[model samples]
Target: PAQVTEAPSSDKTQDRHDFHGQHQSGIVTPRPAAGMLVSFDVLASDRDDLERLFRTLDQRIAFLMRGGPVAQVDPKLPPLDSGILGPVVTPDNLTITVSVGESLFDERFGLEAAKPKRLIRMVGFPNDALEPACCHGDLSLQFCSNTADTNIHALRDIVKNLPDLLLVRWKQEGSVPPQAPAKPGEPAQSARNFLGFRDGSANPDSNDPKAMQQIVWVQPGSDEPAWAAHGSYQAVRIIRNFVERWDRTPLQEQESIIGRIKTSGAPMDGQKESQVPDYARDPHGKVTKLDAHIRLANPRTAQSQQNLILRRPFNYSNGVNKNGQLDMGLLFICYQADLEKGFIAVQTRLNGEPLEEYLKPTGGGYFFTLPGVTGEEDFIGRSLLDATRP
Candidate 1:
């Protein structure tokens, strides 16, 4: 079991704790295009039996594979749920169990972003004591599903026994289908794409520890909170790539739009990664074009410079139509301490660009991942996840 420390009640202490609890992580795997994106939210119950929880989860997973694209069920551990008042002790914790499948998971079609796939996203908290407060374990068992009657009812039934848990109603944008294809010859605009440039084009190469720390937030001081320390806030933006439209723009114009040499990740002004362009020098959009992506997304104000968000996402390509044809766009994922400062700021500035005309915002959500536990059980003991052990 992972040992966690409790925090003494104090304003300063609370700030330090929340900062570490959120804002920090990444994963890469070749999975079927059609599958579930499930999550679980556990509440602190008088019943915190690891054995029972694992057994129930196992049984449910086995039954869910009734054919179709049931790729994998990945359940992550729940953090200790101590109220702002309690000592930072690990109380009965909550765990999130995720189920992924090929069909739609829910009926409401509020899907934001582009594609909609069936997935069960839930959260877990320490116990009933913490429910309805501190966001009703807002971060606790955050749940989501796709659009479908049968699957939605099936999923709801599975966890219906956990009456202590709160089932969240999907937001307006949760089930909306992917947007229509952009008009011909128009590029799409989004937080993920700047000035028609594929922003995360160079991600897989820069996902090391060094890059992570640079883009993510850390606890203010050396003495960080226990349960939440090293964790990170993850935001996903499902962007629909207008490949055909993007291909229409001349290569030179494309290069200028991104402010980087199309082939290499070099800036148009020839500055290195450590240096930024002098947007002022080219007020008329010459060197760094006025409409250049770097100009709009550039950190101009002193505080605005902190808008650096670590982007660690993957490419999700399915078949054709609204979702995608040849290759789908990015599964845009980013992390930052302050959502306003990180993902939102960059996204706001990139709005209404030549890009939005092409790509469209589909479906995505906000999630906070508890950092991985270290030690012998860290690998095997995670939410009863079974794999080959050394």
Candidate 2:
């Protein structure tokens, strides 16, 4: 299996994950309890410096994820560890997924020729008010774990180690609460978003390796560069939820807006969340409204297969904004093998949905995740680095 494989630990509470694999763990690592995305601006002087950055990331990420005792060095040498996780770093199921933004392929390192086929800077959607400072970055590091502080500790380690190579651009912290199945035999549904609806009830099956191969992972024959063979396009959206306004809206109106039962996450006429609405049987929008969010986003047609995205999202609450409204929403992150066909097409269909009234498009960007590091000898971005000789 080319997916995450958990390792057994002596300590029962410690949940450890493998770092080396055919693909990055975070992409389909069973959706951990917490996550954070930190975007960084590269300050490399040349190709060598860029290589240095990636290699350092590969080494550090491996160690941090496979957490263990901190190193002991000369006492005078500024301390080897940040000591954030204390003397012994317990593996808390942390994963660090790396990706490069469009800017990284520009003239800085003569990498324009080796850029992935579909990599591009995220263009603001018609309904978006994207804040420039929070939009894009040279590199995006995503950290996921069972606890929020575990992600923070990992970020601090990277920051402390790569001060000269990376400049912090923007970061967003989010979490998915521990969710048990409603009934013992039933599947555990995705946690609710800030809007209090099951956002992932109809999400494609991520655990199916074949399904992931078809929809999420880049294939060998794709138009992307050889180095990008198994890599995927990552789209992150920092959507702001208008909770106060939504709370005032009637419950029926909210349910109709999302086209799902508020409590059960089922479709308009269906009784369970997993059950798909029969759009063809009710073509005239009798059961579900014509412009409902779910229908418009998916349509449930054969052609809509290309529009599917593997959504791995978390809820973020940043207290409140300057307008005294709750500055909280989804840290929407999705992975797809095709950029144009996946997230872009789905988002285009969602443009005029009724749910727009209760949401705000804020900051986030498009990133091209690099292929997995092959083994202990390999480093992150080794393929790109090898292809573009200095």
Candidate 3:
């Protein structure tokens, strides 16, 4: 028989975030060490069931994030809590960001008329081996926390509470370790992927509210349903890396392919990772190759700026495969207001790039994030549900 380990509360696990607002946490909220995305096949086909689900989920989420004491239950009945975290449940700096997928808009629930204009099922890119098992779901629930145990507890709690409405579709877990800069006195760097390259090196300022609105948040009069005003679009790609193949390649070849220094994460020979490369000076691809992944993804031109997508990714490892090879990859998650101009444009431009040989996208889907709950009376998809009422 196995023995249980004693667990105690700590400062990190006690950290708390807001549950109700004009926008949800975890999107722009600081990325924690543990992150997971679980998609569900919604079982409800009627309006009442769907509406009930939203209200129940909203109440449960508020309690989960707000953190509280587990309620006592009847002596003979099952425990109210799962007891995963023991007697008490800590916030653990948890945030549950909710969103609805394209499939949720069909006649099943009379939501077709309320779907976001650009929301659609995710399609496979040129270098993709998409598996149907993990492709799409009616709902995408993202959980991020300081520890993996907390995230798992929250996921199980949600599933247990809404068993009638949510069925297990597919799930993936990932984590990003603390990145300490090479220079002892320098500040910490951005998170690095499995390939040992700093990710989000050239990302736009998420701290700038105006810039985030322009790049990520869906704007009013964008031809989308009015309910999508403060919402955004989410794209998840499970990209498996050919680590064995990549490790054998020479450093020079790897640097040229990524268009950045692996150690410093600087574009070409630039001094810092934060500075955007000057593509105009190297118009002939003298310093940075014309087909380099970074250059092709973002040309640093006035026109290409519209294609920017806010990337928040994590490193994933699933043990070994049947071939006795290590199985590890990246959980690529990005957000934007327009699907066409965001992930689609960037992926289309990346077709046939030299880096294709080192990576293969396997699963994941496209989802339209819901606008934030306004107050205590508001639920996750209240606005969209009301739109279909009349």
Candidate 4:
């Protein structure tokens, strides 16, 4: 039998999830209060350097999750570890999900052949106004935790050690605070978005293993590379919200645009928020508009259910823009078994949503969350490296 160990609740920060598993933690776990997504480009000259970079990261991340004293050398020398989180640290429910971009499979690493079949660069969408600085990268590090300070400290510690091997391309932080207290056994409710409606109201249930395997995890004997068996496709979009403009809009108009009541994220038909809207009864577009965001995104049909994305969106605010407008919106992160069948399919259906006028997609791209580090000997992307060897 497998041994089970639980953290003592003496400190809330002591809570931690396992670092090694068949799939990464943050994917299915409830969204944390604080999250940071940092993209990077590999600066290493060859495969050996890249391999070393990942190996070192794997070890250090594992250490951080377990929470302990920093390994230091001499009192005369600069400290080996950053004492930012203090000498004794707790995991604080920290999760670090590493992913590789399509650019990583280029000639530099000899990994072109081992690339996942669906792993390709995110192309421009009709509404996209992508900034080069905030767009694509060779890699991404998604850090999630309970505290903002802890998240920043962990990122700083990681970057401090690997300055030579990787260039920090772009970084953004987001928050989605828990809205209400949960009942004894009931799950926590989804947090509200920038628009005030509950976000992730239609997300696939991560707790259901069957649903996860069907929607989020890649199964065996698929078209994807062998290394991608348990991996998942991650799509991130940095959408900027025009809050000032949206705030001025009438509440009735806002509800019509979203197709759901503002107070309770329920469909206009009066169904409970947790229940799927009965679109069949209101096919005439009386209750929920035929072109509403939720109706188009889901469609309430069997075929459309297969297209659902496991949404893990976060709200971001970086302050005001040059024109004095608020620069805040969703750092949209979603996971699916296949991007083409999932996000792309659903997004295509949402071509001209009414809400498009109030949102501007500034940046973000596609990346594959590589399979988990199974044990002490293994590291993320191990299978890809081995298969891509010359």
Candidate 5:
């Protein structure tokens, strides 16, 4: 379970997430109600500015997470606070996950040698019609919070504070259902995607230290750069859901394509949502089709089991397109220790999934999520930045 902290006062609503830890919060943290994935192209002049950018971000983020009063220079001058969240700001379980992109390691910063081993630009798949405008960046700032206002406010504050060092490349706002009320014996409900399917049912348990070490965190003695010891590789896919075409399809066909009962999110032969599908028993693919989305993505065999990725997706709807169709889909974000075994392999396995007919993967790219800050004085990627410096 996530290590949560209650407010110091009597207010039950103020919950503060620990921003400094072994790993970033958003990777394993529960999906917040609202999130914004903001990609940026660095505009810093040199390595000094790059390090200073991280330091400035670190200082501002510490204040944002703790939710305290902003420093005031003068009463007559403009107030430092945005004042969107009222006079007394609450933590609201805010998480600001910072990551560097493959482009950040290029000739600009003189940090090519320190880049994460698997950190590379996302390659185009057979079905991808990537929009150049929405793909690739020097860095990514993922802000997540229980409230939409807080999510937006945090992003605004970051950009407001660091306008000179960062330039916005692309951004998308997304949302997921608030966590379900606790049930007596049942596990928490999974967040649903825009396609009306429970999206993260099979995610590796974040609470399990062994599982995280094996699948999520970059272990020591691996081929990764020493500075990237506890970091993870992040993959983002802005897949546009073709809802009109999907709506036209029959319910049975839709369920067959997904390999689960849409209502319960259970495997074809199972009743409960959490029950694993019996792929071995159904060799001929009667219960679940051979090309079914879930089956292809996860075959349940030993080799396939090694390909699990930690999914932390959110649903996005940015109004309509030129044809007046709903311009919406999933902001599919996942983390893994190894990109090749985790995302690339699973994506290759899902090349021609039956569900692909109604999905258009338009944009998003890969990032190397840095390890967490240790204290108020520490900045994210400090070790990597130190090594990269002359």
Candidate 6:
């Protein structure tokens, strides 16, 4: 897909109240679409059935693999569960869903995770998701001008009905609802706060604009991975915090802990939210605390790389009754060239932050979006015969 400049616009604003109507309506909107990276553990008794299910899923995915930006869609059968150091695994299933691009499922989960304390990540064109009728969060797919949209949507619709999919828990009673949309201006939905600093105050996008253009690398070797070349990496993290524990801290310490004023993204030293901070000079730590979010993620020093990720995160509130929560945390998604240098670094630095005292990470994963193809032929290799056979 061609590189499009997304500076920021007011036309795409979203609020908690607006989402509330979308969720209760049960109708799909053009909001954030989600893609999941789920790993279902095969049980000892149901190993064979699970294996067969995997095979069926693979076949179904292959069948859906028409010609498009779907670079890679192969199921991974890890040799053992012990080796996997990612998302928590239960006895039966372990899945990681990536939320992007519009569709019934992505939209459902993306919307559902918007409740209070639920994990949500708002990236790319989500602000516009509501503008365009039924818009998906996938930029590559939307870049399609002619037939790409029709073909991709058709593929998604078909996959939605695929019987191989074993349903996961959602919002509904016995069955789980995809996602519950929130209302505008609410903490879970609105990107703004009482102070209007663009609620995602710590987002990398708010950094030096020039710095962003330089750091975000264009995907290379498109010819090699034709589908995934121009695409970027989306990493979602579900972080749940202990509000009671955090709220107990003194307001001064609390401000020091979060690094910036919760109301505005401004620096504690009175710097503008859009300007840079003088981390090195905060010697006595009077301005910014030593353990603050900005202190750890300060982009001016060698540690800058840690804060160098593009942020488009949202809040999730999916959980059981207040006691046994379903999924309440952060849908932390960032886009960058290298996952290690981008999200990983910041996450590693955040390992013991004061924030962790209250929050618990529950879900999320990584997925690569494919670059745009000019036509179906380009996608299916210009060979009409092989293309037609499928």
Q: How many residue pairs clash in each candidate?
A: 62, 0, 0, 0, 0, 64
Over 1-390, each residue of candidate 5 has an lDDT whose tens digit, in order, gives 434673233332376788898787888887678887889999999888898898888877777888976566688886677877766666787889988999999998899988887788989999999999999999998888877788777877888888899999999889987665878988666878888888888788889989998888998778888888888998999999999888889989988999988888888999978877999999999999999998999999988877999988889998888997899999989999998888989999999888889999999989988988877666877978877777
107-203: candidate 6 lDDT, tens digit per residue: 2222222111111232322111121221122211111101222223323432353334443221101111223565775333225321122444445
Q: For model 4, how does the per-residue alpha-carbon lDDT over 290-348 read when each residue is reduced to its tens digit?
A: 88889889897878878988999899999899998999999999999999888888888
Which model is ahead, 2 or 4, in terms of lDDT? Answer: 2
Question: Best-fitting candidate, measured by lDDT?
Answer: 3
Candidate 2 local lDDT, 226-335, one digit each (tens): 77888899999999999999999999999888889999899987888888899999899888888999889889899998788898999998977788898888999999
Clashes of 2: 0
Cα lDDT of candidate 5 equals 0.86
Per-residue lDDT for 126 in model 6?
Answer: 14
Q: Residue 124 of model 5: what lDDT?
A: 91
Clash-forming residue pairs, model 2: none
TM-score of each: 0.48, 0.95, 0.96, 0.94, 0.94, 0.49
Pick the winner on TM-score between candidates 3 and 5: 3
Q: Which lDDT values do the candidates have, in the order given?
A: 0.40, 0.87, 0.88, 0.85, 0.86, 0.37
Model 6 quality (TM-score): 0.49
Tell me the lDDT of candidate 2: 0.87
Give RMSD to native, each candidate. 18.2, 5.3, 2.4, 5.4, 4.8, 17.2
